[PDB]
Amino acid sequence: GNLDVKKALLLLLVGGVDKRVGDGMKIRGDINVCLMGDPGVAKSQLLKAICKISPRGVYTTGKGSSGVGLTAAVMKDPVTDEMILEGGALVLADNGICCIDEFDKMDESDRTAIHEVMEQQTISISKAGINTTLNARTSILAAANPLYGRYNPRLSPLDNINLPAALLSRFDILFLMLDIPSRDDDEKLAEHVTYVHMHNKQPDLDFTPVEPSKMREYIAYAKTKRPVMSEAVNDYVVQAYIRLRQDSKREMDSKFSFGQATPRTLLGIIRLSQALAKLRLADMVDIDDVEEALRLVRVSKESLY
Amino acid sequence: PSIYGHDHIKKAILLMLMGGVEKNLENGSHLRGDINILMVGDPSTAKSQLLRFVLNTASLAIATTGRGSSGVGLTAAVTTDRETGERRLEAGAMVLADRGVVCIDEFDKMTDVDRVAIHEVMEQQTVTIAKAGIHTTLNARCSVIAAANPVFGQYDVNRDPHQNIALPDSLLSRFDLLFVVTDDINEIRDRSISEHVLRTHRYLPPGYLEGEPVRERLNLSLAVGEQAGAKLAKNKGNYNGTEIPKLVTIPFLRKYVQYAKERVIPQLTQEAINVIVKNYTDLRNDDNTKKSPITARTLETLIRLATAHAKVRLSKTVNKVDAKVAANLLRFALLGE
Amino acid sequence: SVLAAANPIYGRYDDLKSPGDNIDFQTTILSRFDMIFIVKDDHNEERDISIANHVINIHTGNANAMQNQQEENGSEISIEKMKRYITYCRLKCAPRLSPQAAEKLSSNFVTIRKQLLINELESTERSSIPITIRQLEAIIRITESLAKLELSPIAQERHVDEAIRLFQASTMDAASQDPIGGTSLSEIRRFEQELKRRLPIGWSTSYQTLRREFVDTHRFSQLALDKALYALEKHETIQLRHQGQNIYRS
Amino acid sequence: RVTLQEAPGTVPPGRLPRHREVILLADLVDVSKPGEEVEVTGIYKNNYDGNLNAKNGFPVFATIIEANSIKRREGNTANEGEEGLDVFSWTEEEEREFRKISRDRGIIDKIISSMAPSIYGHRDIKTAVACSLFGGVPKNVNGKHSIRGDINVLLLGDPGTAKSQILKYVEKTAHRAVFATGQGASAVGLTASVRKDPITKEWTLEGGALVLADKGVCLIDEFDKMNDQDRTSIHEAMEQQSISISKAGIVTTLQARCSIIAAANPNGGRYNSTLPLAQNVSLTEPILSR
Amino acid sequence: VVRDEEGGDYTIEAGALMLADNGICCIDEFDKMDISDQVAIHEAMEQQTISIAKAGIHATLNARTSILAAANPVGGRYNRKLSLRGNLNMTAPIMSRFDLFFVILDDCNEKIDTELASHIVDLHMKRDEAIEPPFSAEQLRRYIKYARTFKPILTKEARSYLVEKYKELRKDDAQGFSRSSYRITVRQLESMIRLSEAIARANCVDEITPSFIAEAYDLLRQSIIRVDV
Amino acid sequence: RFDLVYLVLDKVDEKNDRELAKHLTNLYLVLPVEFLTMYISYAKEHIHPIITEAAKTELVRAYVGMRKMGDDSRSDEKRITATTRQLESMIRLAEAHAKMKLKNVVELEDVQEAVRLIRSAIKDYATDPK
DNA sequence: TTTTTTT
DNA sequence: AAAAAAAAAAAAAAAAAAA
């Protein structure tokens, strides 16, 4: 299952609108999507699969070592101890894919680093006069678990993930994985898992015409094409944002308060439409891409209930 | 034999000592293969004694205590060899017990920091050391048995099970089987256990009189040591007559375990699949109170328990009887008889 | 072996306050211990007179002679001889039990377990001092030590009785020491009203008649017996004589 | 040989001390103890060194002080009453006059009236302080019973009652005086502490405040406001007269003969006469009874 | 006390008051305070010294300081109904440590604020360096260092008037209420002695005139006239 | 004790959202150069403007006015909203207005701009009451 | 305001 | 003539935090 999560993964692998605008204003093609759900939903396993299928993916999780962030790998490395360093930098953050597990586990230092990597902002932390900042341009994909270990009947934003609201609003897409006890889904899941166990392989039950090497080729191919933006979508996206602000006119009704008002919502909408135009098609942007992006956003939002 | 009751605990220990096989896929990476069991209960109900028995019975085992250990010193250490003047990794505690079993006492009384390390070794059974110019991954495929006290002095049966335990659910969901033991005060059971304990304390080592204490002894006569099928000297195992059911001595049991862990690698079949899936679907939607919530990983536990029970009866295929016994044991361990 | 000296909260034991919030130790730690002695301070002025006498005597001007006589009459022995005796007894002997002692221990353990249950179901909170199998091992080891003291290679009823007496002292002083911690009190005042009206000062009545009457009424047996024995504990208007048959109103 | 720093009360504020080395020849051995303030009369001498000339590039010389006389100056800063190495030592005629004036009638009256002649009233305190700084006789019965022979004293009342002046005079009076106050003393500070030697590179014991008070008095000001964790650690020092440490592999027992004089303030800053002592202070029976 | 890690002797660091030693100190925003530092200072002011023994080291420090502090009424503005104890949260014993109090109030009068604004503006313009005090700073310092070299003594009439005034003060403020009014101690008498000595020192006189005692008593009286207003 | 304060409150309206969306789309779809820096430096260190006697009357009138605006005929005992910090702030702001345009003495326009600027933020500084 | 825990 | 030091374990004091 989990088709729409994989669709979002596809749209994350291509990248959004990039290469700046007039007057030099900064825009990034990277997409920040956070996965949220109960334990035992195999979001970590899907993250591992994505890390395997991507060349630039880097995987991180809660603690276990102190060299993951804020320090270069060459700290005190040479036998002569030349203090080789760059200063403020992360692990291959230039055009990397930062995969994080247990996003509510790390300390304040890693949290400060991930607030600093925001929106293609470079890392300029200095300790001994070093100011060679690392050009941080990476897509953020992180999985976090609720502090209760389960979904809650009361309001979600107060339950949240014990995360800053600014950091939450930074992310482009928030998706949920809620365990619903039911017969017709658990039956299929158990059947698939046991059939996998019986064959000791990937069973012929799966029906996939395309292969991991084939995906690795086609993703680079699609990124190479790089379609440009089409003007006529302007009015459609403006009225879409008008109705989204109409939603914000109803966000004080509560019972879920993720229908906030933020220009980053429109920016992510445009980025996802550009990614949909990039994954296929000619050098234009289709209105159907905007509609698909809005439908994806609606599917992400409706998981609250 | 000196521990009264706790029959299902003994069965769980037996199944754990000879757990299921490992699974590795060219695309599916690796799947965990053995069983882990946790004990929480009221004080003085013979948990440490059973853990000591598991220490002595198993082939390879290492003893750890929550308060007497440090997480960084548990997995690896950076020490310099004297002759070469070079600093080399020193094997940690649980790395020495790879493929064996590690027993932890006073588990909940451990420092929280060390706990995260445990989660790592319960995630993919591998510990990585990146420090002082060494980057290496160390294999550790051991199983963990542990016992912990409730938050209060005694277990409160009217409260939330999560309220009674000090450990976060993140690592508690990792454990396959969780057992709750409580000493219900019933005069009949009191008399029975009193008879058993008083029977135990009146024991004398053979060939030795009762008037003097136990003394130290010398080693075996030979520094190095090393008609068939007609004697059954220790084969039947019944050393003395106390009950109609038979018993077996420890060395024969260890020989059976050694034979079973090597000579058979069973495979499951579709009938056990049908039984397991039916039980999982029923348990998922029984919709009543339970000690712990259930998820998809319990089906893995059923699969591995069926595999272990097939290993017990020395069959190359898993039959539905093992599915039935695994389901019954799980229902006992999570619902309660 | 572990020997520990500890003070309760608020200094003095403060019997008016419940035992549960007088001892801060958890249930686990107390179970490992097996002899717990509540040393309360009391004022009756005769023990006080005797203690003042003993202290002023043990003042170094006097006791330095008197203790010497304890080594001259053979009443007490020197410390180092005791040290040699204990090391010799530890090395030499290690006694064993007998089946009759086992049966007696089993019955005594069942009795104390039942008493703990009957206290708990009344107070309706968990006992601050538990009774578990470790206490049975404790009594067994106490009996073993008692037999070891005399080098007898077996332990018999003579040591078992002393061990049970010591255990009962050390458990009744602490665990069952007022387990209630001080229907509610409404029936208590109703009960006290009627016997005062019905039964005057100087006469007496049978226990069975009172129990029958107040079980026939709403008081019932559980409430009346505790009320009767606490009115006795008041020890200012009602006295017991001639076994439990006569209820004398002084 | 020993290292001599500057007195913290003598160095200019916010500066750093200057160390010197003092060598103690025969008969002066062990006269000085760690942590105490001392005054030494000696000879200043210079000698050649190699590494000193190496690290500076100039012909620099080292200097050491050969001790010739040592005088203790801990606590008793009143240094004008008399001269000499030891002001608590007596001549023979001083002993004769002690005997002569120890026999007249009402000598206790004169002694009690001769303490703090600048404070009016408070006769009971002027008696209790003398009885505290004389002390009793420690008793040892057969070597198996021990009876403490020193008296503790506690003061209590409203502000403005000149308690601190009495404490200062007591410090000026006794042979061994240690002064503490309020939050300014920690539990591990009064008692001996475990320290790792920065040179020999292992654990060792560091003398606490009470150790300096052995055969002497320890004075505490603002007893009530001291945190209870900083207060419960001196029970053995009051009663058993013994200090035991089992820390970092070291299991030792020290010796401490100290008399504690403490002062405090009741709840609310004033003593309410119409209430018992239990509702006037926050202390409990175990500490009060001592 | 400060140490480098695994560094012996815990070398002490001088505090702000310790730096202020042997000289005049100034404190600002006095109401906010460290509780441990507060209980240190209120015993330190009477002793005029502070001694802290920690981590196996002990020492006695000198803190011969004159304290000058400013506070703020609780609730923003001074409530005229209540008194200093009601208005300030600062503890009772410290109030008796201080010898004088000054309370200043701002108002909405139209005549005052115009004068204040004129004074403030008139400094950025015109007499930017031509404000008119009767004496220059150098003259002030010359007179201060000439007067500081005088030590007054007391006479018989001074002592008699002094004890009479002390008795009057003690009886007057004790007649108000019990267990809610407690402000006159012997330290108040010592403060009045010190103030009289200072006043006589201002006029460069080697003796004491009872008029100085009258002025000091008036100051301490208005410090209690103000607590009622 | 800050000199001034500013508040930004984004509320959803059809119009303002329409203009914001149009502006953002147009940008996504008259400015000097380091000349600014050298001009700022020249004003900073060559120019030392001072206030004049005429501006004092306007300053004191504004102070008296906001004192009155901070009070009413009723006995509510209104907070004293006209603090000395306000006078210091307006003096500094009037000096700053003369700092630009390279003038040497302030004019009335400077003080009216300064007082309007200092009072605009106060006008939106009120809580839910009034 | 107090005790606890972390640096 | 010189191996000498990064990595651990254990003992405090200060500050801040929660009840």
Ligand SMILES: Nc1ncnc2c1ncn2[C@@H]1O[C@H](COP(=O)(O)OP(=O)(O)OP(=O)(O)O)[C@@H](O)[C@H]1O
């Ligand atoms: N949809 C699914 N299909 C197949 N297996 C699944 C599915 N959901 C869960 N599982 C099983 O659950 C396990 C992975 O869940 P896991 O708890 O590791 O992931 P998670 O939700 O990221 O949580 P956690 O932080 O506890 O690891 C695997 O054993 C996997 O087989």
Ligand SMILES: Nc1ncnc2c1ncn2[C@@H]1O[C@H](COP(=O)(O)OP(=O)(O)OP(=O)(O)O)[C@@H](O)[C@H]1O
């Ligand atoms: N069923 C039983 N059979 C035999 N002995 C028993 C039984 N139940 C309890 N005991 C006895 O109870 C005692 C408890 O010892 P032990 O410390 O091992 O128990 P525990 O339940 O693990 O306690 P803890 O949690 O305090 O470690 C032992 O002496 C053991 O012999």
Ligand SMILES: Nc1ncnc2c1ncn2[C@@H]1O[C@H](COP(=O)(O)OP(=O)(O)OP(=O)(O)O)[C@@H](O)[C@H]1O
């Ligand atoms: N007879 C006396 N009684 C009380 N105080 C006196 C007497 N004679 C002089 N004094 C002065 O009274 C003052 C009282 O001392 P101080 O103000 O230092 O505090 P305290 O009373 O010792 O205690 P606290 O610090 O607890 O208030 C001293 O300055 C002392 O010189």
Ligand SMILES: [Mg+2]
């Ligand atoms: Mg996960």
Ligand SMILES: [Mg+2]
């Ligand atoms: Mg146990």
